[PDB]
Design a protein around this ligand. Sequence first.
Ligand SMILES: CCn1nc(C#Cc2c(C)ccc3c(Nc4ccc(Cl)cc4)nccc23)c2c(N)ncnc21
Ligand SMILES: CCn1nc(C#Cc2c(C)ccc3c(Nc4ccc(Cl)cc4)nccc23)c2c(N)ncnc21
Lengths: 253, 274
Amino acid sequence: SDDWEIPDGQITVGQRIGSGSFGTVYKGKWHGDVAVKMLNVTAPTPQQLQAFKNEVGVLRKTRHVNILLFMGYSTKPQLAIVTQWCEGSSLYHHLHASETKFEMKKLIDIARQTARGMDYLHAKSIIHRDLKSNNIFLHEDNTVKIGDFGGSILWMAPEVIRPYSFQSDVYAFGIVLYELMTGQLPYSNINNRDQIIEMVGRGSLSPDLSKVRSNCPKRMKRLMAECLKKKRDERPSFPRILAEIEELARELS
Amino acid sequence: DDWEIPDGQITVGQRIGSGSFGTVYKGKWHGDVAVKMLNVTAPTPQQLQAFKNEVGVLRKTRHVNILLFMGYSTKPQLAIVTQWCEGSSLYHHLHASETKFEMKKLIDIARQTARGMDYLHAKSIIHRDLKSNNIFLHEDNTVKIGDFGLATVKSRWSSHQFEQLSGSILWMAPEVIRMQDSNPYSFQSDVYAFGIVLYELMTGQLPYSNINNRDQIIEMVGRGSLSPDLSKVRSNCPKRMKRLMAECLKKKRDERPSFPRILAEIEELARELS
Ligand SMILES: CCn1nc(C#Cc2c(C)ccc3c(Nc4ccc(Cl)cc4)nccc23)c2c(N)ncnc21
Ligand SMILES: CCn1nc(C#Cc2c(C)ccc3c(Nc4ccc(Cl)cc4)nccc23)c2c(N)ncnc21
């Protein structure tokens, strides 16, 4: 992978879609529909430039169906990152902001695609911090795309509260399994935001697994409980997680 | 030495078929993938050079309408890995399954193919042998462009050992047919191939159904007397679509529009019917 810079003037920026991890995200026209994440500043700060370079160097190493397709970047007009245009909404929107009623097979398949993406990233020695249902996009409502999109304490691990590792990502994936199988956020009953942080970091608070659906598979619930282990080094690696999820899904096709 | 996949990470599965070189299987590597490997003990200079050329061309592509290259392996054997797509080729849907899409779907397939081809032309990549067999319908909704078929190889002793690119003679342009010199292919020949694809999309059949002899097609098209019958287009086919298809099928090489203009026309057409 080399020479991925897009010259200025080739992209036609369109409607502003919102604010991303840094800068603003628009929909652009460049050999089809694309998404442009730009930094609307005249001169970027050292922090901004280093974050841009790190994110671009991480994106140029990814070629997987369940990872958002990086396509190029621009620096001459301003810092910009170009990705594929996806049709659909984030998993958080489907679960907690919309009334979409998925099938259990669809939930299992979403979990499997997310596990595939995360195992791919871990194979590249890439720790994805701030993993949540907002960061899992449903392309055409059928394909999972993982990315760092633009409150995230719900997925935070006890160690991160007190430093990021693969095990924190496994715990975040466990929380994702929780919101997939139950349908709601982990601690709805707890209302004080600061209380949740201290309680979970201390270790007294943990998700209520009675919220899982009756048709939720046994092995799926057991794996979700194993991924949400309070101890950092008690959680399985993502190869075993993907293997269990694939063995579960492959018996329903 | 980047993008190399270590040995043992991929679990090769059911043989899916024969690719451009070697054999193509479905494999397990962080999910479902497709592996095109060369089942030889020691590769020849030609085989290794072809592998390296294809890998170097694939490593420059990151587009939704181009088949996603994922990596390669060399320790067990020369192999190229791409994403696993569910569905069938456009040729299968049109002439082997006779699936009747809606006009919107035909327009959208043409639009996605135009996106992919304009992307490739922007990278100075001339994709020869563009046809409906080389256009895969991932989930029957997304276009993926790739080199799935075989090339034409003349038999050393008599008339053809390989003839799949002679199967693509239907999509060959008159200039490519005539002289067959060192690379008669151009961006305009790809434009003509895309025009033939538009023809089989809007009519539903191959350009020369009544003519069966390949030599007749060669002589007639190269001479300049033969061209697809555009009366076979459907009545609901847009006028602009037929006009663009006729402009892409111009007998002269330098009378056909470039793929930026083609993609612009197709996108402006599609955005007026949604
Ligand atoms: C609803 C609003 N919305 N936002 C879109 C976007 C975007 C992004 C852009 C432009 C650039 C970088 C991103 C990125 N970086 C990244 C870093 C590390 C790794 Cl491993 C993976 C990804 N993560 C996530 C997203 C982007 C978007 C779209 N593409 N289609 C439809 N709606 C969309
Ligand atoms: C018929 C059954 N079949 N065959 C699949 C495959 C494959 C390929 C592999 C493994 C490697 C290289 C390819 C390639 N090279 C290439 C060169 C230049 C350019 Cl620009 C673009 C592509 N062109 C086409 C395909 C492959 C396949 C799949 N991925 N999913 C489902 N069914 C499938």
